[PDB]
Each structure stands twice: as structure tokens, then as C-alpha cells.
Design a binder for this molecule. Structure first.
Ligand SMILES: Cc1cc2nc3c(=O)[nH]c(=O)nc-3n(C[C@H](O)[C@H](O)[C@H](O)COP(=O)(O)O)c2cc1C
Ligand SMILES: [Ca+2]
Ligand SMILES: [Cl-]
Length: 146
């Protein structure tokens, strides 16, 4: 199909990279795993803001937490219900953080999704946050020279 995955998009994790310089802070990179999770083709989602993942049972207070982190240029970790292209629900243990350049300016945002079947707590929450934060750090390394 269109937009063959780059090497970075073949990293075996669900993530996207957005460019806040572009209209509506849209996706510019999306991993193959993210596409498999969400059922979209890459062409379908490039240039779009990630809010298409939200639907009727998505808690809007949790979306506001993400909105506020983006506008304060700071990280956040939350859990919220998201939807695939066909309307299948999944829980998303979600981590966002900015990627800074060598002047400390925000160049991209990185978002990492750990899909699950339930809201998690305790050990499953801790292990999931470990995984998505480590992944975000790895994508920070991977995306620094893009
Ligand atoms: C890098 C990045 C990744 C995002 N990933 C998700 C996601 O997995 N799920 C989601 O519901 N929102 C995600 N968002 C949040 C939305 O794109 C958007 O910021 C949120 O809906 C608040 O803005 P709005 O009020 O204009 O919709 C992501 C945002 C960014 C910048
Ligand atoms: Ca799942
Ligand atoms: Cl749990």
C-alpha cells in the first residue's frame, strides 16, 4: 500500500509521532503495530490528529488531561477507552511526552499505546507503565535525528 513503513515504524511497539508545526498536530509516523491494533492503513491516518481513536465511552475528563499536557509541553500517563476503525473498543494505557531538540525546543510529540482489555491497577499498571515509558525513551532516541 501507500507509505511503506520506515525502519523506525517497524519498531515492534504501538506508537505515533506527531509534528505540532503542522495543522492540528497530526500523525507523521505510525508504527506497523499501531496500524494492526487500530485497523487503519498508514495513508488513512497520516496528517490527522489522533482524536479519531476516541468514541462514545471515552472519558472526556481523561482526554482533557492529555490536551493539557500537550499545551503545557509535558508528559502524561493515563488510561482511556479507544476505538479501532471498525468500532472495536480497547483500553489504552497511554503515555505522551514531547521530544526536544538540542536547544530544548519541542520538535515532536511521541505517544505510546499499551492496548488491553480492562482498566489496570497495581502490578499490571506498574508493569504497563514500565513498558510504555521505556518504549517512549527508545522512540526519543530513535526520532532525535529525523
Ligand atoms: C503524540 C500524540 C499521540 C496521541 N495518541 C492518542 C491516543 O492513543 N489516544 C487518544 O485518545 N488520543 C491520543 N492523542 C490525543 C489527541 O490527539 C488530542 O490531543 C486530544 O484529543 C486532545 O485535543 P482535542 O481536545 O483537540 O481533541 C495523542 C496526541 C498526541 C500529540
Ligand atoms: Ca488488547
Ligand atoms: Cl490490574
Amino acid at each position: 500500500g501507500e507509505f511503506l513503513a520506515t525502519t523506525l515504524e517497524r519498531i515492534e511497539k504501538n506508537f505515533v509521532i506527531t509534528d505540532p508545526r503542522l495543522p492540528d498536530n497530526p500523525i507523521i509516523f505510525a508504527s506497523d503495530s499501531f496500524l494492526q491494533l487500530t485497523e487503519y492503513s498508514r495513508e488513512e491516518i497520516l496528517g490527522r490528529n489522533c482524536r479519531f481513536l476516541q468514541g462514545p465511552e471515552t472519558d472526556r475528563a481523561t482526554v482533557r488531561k492529555i490536551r493539557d499536557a500537550i499545551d503545557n509541553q509535558t508528559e502524561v500517563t493515563v488510561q482511556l477507552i479507544n476505538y479501532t476503525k471498525s468500532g472495536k473498543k480497547f483500553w489504552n494505557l497511554f503515555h505522551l511526552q514531547p521530544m526536544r531538540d538540542q536547544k530544548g525546543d519541542v520538535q515532536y510529540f511521541i505517544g505510546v499505546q499499551l492496548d488491553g482489555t480492562e482498566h489496570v491497577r497495581d502490578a499490571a499498571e506498574r508493569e504497563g507503565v514500565m513498558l510504555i515509558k521505556k518504549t517512549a525513551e527508545n522512540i526519543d532516541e530513535a526520532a532525535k535525528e529525523l
